[PDB]
Structures are given as C-alpha cells and as structure tokens.
Design a protein around this nucleic acid. Structure first.
Ligand SMILES: Cc1cn([C@H]2C[C@H](O)[C@@H](COP(=O)(O)NP(=O)(O)OP(=O)(O)O)O2)c(=O)[nH]c1=O
Ligand SMILES: [Mn+2]
Ligand SMILES: [Mn+2]
Ligand code: NA
Ligand code: NA
Length: 326
DNA sequence: CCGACGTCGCATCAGC
DNA sequence: GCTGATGCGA
DNA sequence: GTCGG
C-alpha cells in the first residue's frame, strides 16, 4: 500500500465523475490509473515518475504533484464542500441507486438517510432493499465467513441435483482475506450453448437457498442471473451476522472457463484483458472467445478447455486468480 | 489531433 | 403484449 | 482522462 494517498485520491475522483458528472470514461480512466499505481512497487516521488505508467497522463501527473506537495488536492476539497455533489455521492451508495436516480432524488430535497426512509414509497424494489440493508452492506466479509457460506451454498446445491456444480468466484477465488460480497458460478449439465433441457434451473436453487433461510431477499432475478441478499446462521444467544450481498450466475456448462474467467475478475483486470484481446483481434465475453473478421464482425467460437487457453490466444502468460487483483 | 474506451443481465419505461 | 433505450449492476 | 496511430 505504498501509494495509498494517491490511489484513494484517484478513486475519489473516479467516484465523482461517475456519480456526479456522469462521465463514465473519465471514471474508468481514474480507476485504471489508480490500479496501475496500486501495483507499482515503488513509493512515487513525483508525478513525472507516475507519467511513465500507462493510463497516467498529464492531468493526473499534475494532480499527483499537487497531492505530494500539499498532502491534499484542491479540486477534491471544493467537491467535498459542494453539498449537491456530496449529497449525490451519498445516495449512489445505496444499491439500486445510480447517478441519475440520485440526482433526481436530490431535486426533491431527498438527500439524507432519513430522507430515504420517510420517502420509502419513492423507491423501486432494488432501492428499497438496498436501503434496508445499507448498514450491513457497508461491512466486509472475512474469508472465514466466506468459507462458511460456500459450504452452505455448495451443499444445498448438491441436495437439489447432485450434478449441479457451484463455484465461488469473485475476490474469494482471487484468495482475498476479505470480500465485499459472495459471487457464485453455477453449472448444470442440462444447460449448454446447445439447449435449455430444463426450465427453472436457477430458480430451483434460489428456492432451495430460500427454504433454508440463507437467501433472505431478491434484488433481481432471471433465468441466468440472480441478485439478492444472504445471511449466515447464528447460534444461540449470538448477535446476528450482517446481511451479505450475493450474486449467482448460471452459465452454459460447456462455456464454463470463459465464465469462470469473467466472474473471477477483477473488473479492471478483465477490462484490460478484453481490451488486449481486441488489439490482438479477438473478442471475449463470459461465453466465448471469438476472432474478429476483416470487417470487425466476430467469427465462430474458438475451442476453449481451460482458463489458460484463453490467455494463449491473446499472447498472455497465464496469471493465477491471485494475480488478477488489479 | 481524435476516436474509442469490455461485455452483458435484469428492471424499467417509451412507443407502438 | 412486443422491441429498443436507458439505468444500474455483475 | 488517456492514448495509439
Ligand atoms: C462490478 C463488476 C463486476 N465485474 C466482474 C468481475 C468481478 O470480479 C466479478 C464479481 O463482481 P463483484 O463482486 O462486484 N467484484 P469482486 O468479487 O471482484 O470484488 P469484491 O470482493 O466483491 O468487493 O464480476 C465486471 O466485469 N465489471 C463490473 O463492473
Ligand atoms: Mn464479489
Ligand atoms: Mn458481486
Ligand atoms: Na503515461
Ligand atoms: Na449504487
């Protein structure tokens, strides 16, 4: 954490441009610069040194100079005491609330935590639940708790159909000592790129995980993606565990490796990999890696049978999950 | 300079 | 009801 | 905001 103050500054700038300015690319530029600096093994002595890194240009270099000299950045000081910006930035932290909904909520005077509670009738379902567990969602999950949840999910899954395979991707698979949520890839042999030989495949798993009071809430649900809330069971006389966000993704069994690559992350690592795939003339999603034609239009799925195979096509040495934490 | 910036799932709304 | 765009999220 | 070309 050598360059902690800097990466925080850029991350805060990223949040600003996303939530307030609604400038998504600026937001990704800051997050990209913060990431490349995050894994820079030196304590940066000057902006020009940082400018030697990709994703770090003139404007950020100048801001880094200002930060390194004063210990602060004036643009952020101004933003911090801007009440509208501070209000919008806050509302966006509630799940289901983005820059647009936050901005309009502020136009109605709804700009604090109680504002959201007394005006509960103005939220859709996602925002209602996202506010219901705002406090709990702020807490991280120690890896120890992640391990408990994986036993439950994997065993409950086993009980519905023993051919379900369930893998816990996300930062957990990246070996993080603490995660922000739980991410689960799911594969049943009846669901391939060829056919859905069984309906309700994901529904029945959600159903089972609700029966055991593991999944307490749903933010959204489809035939391939679930977004909701879970909770570890506490013993007698114990304070309850915080409610945890959970994501479940049903991906066609034969397209597992593109799926496990996608959901393992990190999100930036992905964005850099897929952007590199393009420069090599490939396009990767959670399903397939495919070549790009002479006209841009992608061709047929190339054969993939390992995580490493996808790294090969784009001329990248395989990086274990632990090393994708950009 | 400038075009492009990973890719896609669900909720939701506009328009028909 | 559907198609496509938009908002928010993975 | 950055950068390839
Ligand atoms: C949010 C998000 C996720 N993803 C992919 C990569 C993430 O690793 C994976 C899971 O989403 P997440 O749980 O929001 N990210 P996380 O598991 O990497 O980090 P954390 O430990 O939950 O905070 O999905 C993207 O590719 N773009 C995104 O914007
Ligand atoms: Mn996660
Ligand atoms: Mn997640
Ligand atoms: Na640079
Ligand atoms: Na949000």
């Amino acid at each position: 954490t050598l360059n902690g103050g800097i990466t925080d500054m850029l991350t805060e700038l990223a949040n600003f441009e996303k939530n307030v300015s609604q400038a998504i690319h600026k937001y990704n530029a800051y997050r990209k610069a913060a990431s490349v600096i995050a894994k820079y093994p030196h304590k940066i002595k000057s902006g020009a040194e940082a400018k030697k890194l990709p994703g770090v240009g003139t404007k950020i270099a100048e801001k880094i100079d200002e930060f390194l000299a004063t210990g602060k950045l004036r643009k952020l000081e101004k933003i911090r005491q801007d009440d509208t910006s501070s209000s919008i930035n806050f509302l966006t932290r509630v799940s289901g609330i983005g820059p647009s909904a936050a901005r309009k909520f502020v136009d109605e005077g709804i700009k604090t935590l109680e504002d959201l509670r007394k005006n509960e009738d103005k939220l859709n379902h996602h925002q209602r639940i996202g506010l219901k567990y705002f406090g709990d969602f702020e807490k991280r999950i120690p890896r120890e708790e992640m391990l408990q949840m994986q036993d439950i999910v994997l065993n409950e899954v086993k009980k519905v159909d023993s051919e379900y395979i369930a893998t816990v991707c996300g930062s957990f698979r990246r070996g993080a000592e603490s995660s922000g949520d739980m991410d689960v890839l799911l594969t049943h042999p009846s669901f391939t790129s060829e056919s859905t030989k069984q309906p309700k495949l994901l529904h029945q798993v959600v159903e089972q995980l609700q029966k055991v009071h593991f999944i307490t809430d749903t933010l959204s649900k489809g035939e391939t993606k679930f977004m909701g809330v879970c909770q570890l069971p506490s013993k007698n006389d114990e304070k309850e565990y915080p409610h945890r966000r959970i994501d479940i993704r049903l991906i066609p069994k034969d397209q597992y490796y593109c799926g496990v690559l996608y959901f393992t992350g990190s999100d930036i690592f992905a964005k850099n990999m897929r952007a590199h795939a393009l420069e090599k003339g490939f396009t990767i999603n959670e399903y397939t890696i495919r070549p790009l034609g002479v006209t841009g239009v992608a061709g047929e799925p190339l054969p993939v049978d390992s995580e490493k195979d996808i790294f090969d096509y784009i001329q990248w040495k395989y990086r274990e999950p632990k090393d994708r934490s950009e």
